[PDB]
């Protein structure tokens, strides 16, 4: 393609995308953390088996 | 972002036009001075956005 003189390219971040992608990432993180809490539940139940 | 860029670049154009009209109307009576007009145009609109 052509070039511009006296104009520049805006970095391709519409901040909204990454902000809501942050809430989503925090979401998956928290869900997986809850699953780890369930892992501890299971394993301490194994502790309780004794 | 791009919406604010739109807001501002139009502000730039409006300021330039005001400057031009003030320039002319002030210079109005000088012998040898010709009326002058300021023109607008669109950016290097090129596509990667879908």
Curated annotation (Swiss-Prot), chain B:
Domain of life of the source: Bacteria
Cellular location(s): Secreted; Bacterial flagellum
Cysteines paired by S-S bonds: none
Any coiled-coil regions, as ranges: none
Family (UniProt): Belongs to the flagella basal body rod proteins family.
Name of the protein in question: Flagellar hook-associated protein 1
Organism: Salmonella typhi
Gene: flgK
Span covered, complete protein: 2 to 51 of 553
């Amino acid at each position: 393609g052509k070039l511009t003189n006296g104009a520049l390219e805006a970095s391709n971040v519409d901040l909204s995308k990454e902000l809501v992608n942050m809430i989503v990432a925090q979401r998956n993180y928290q869900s997986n953390a809850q699953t780890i809490k369930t892992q501890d539940q299971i394993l301490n139940t194994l502790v309780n088996l004794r | 972002s791009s919406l604010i860029n739109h807001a501002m670049s139009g502000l730039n154009a409006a300021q330039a036009a005001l400057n031009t009209v003030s320039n002319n109307i002030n210079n109005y009576n000088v012998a040898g001075y010709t009326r002058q007009t300021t023109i607008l145009a669109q950016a290097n609109s090129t596509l990667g956005a879908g």
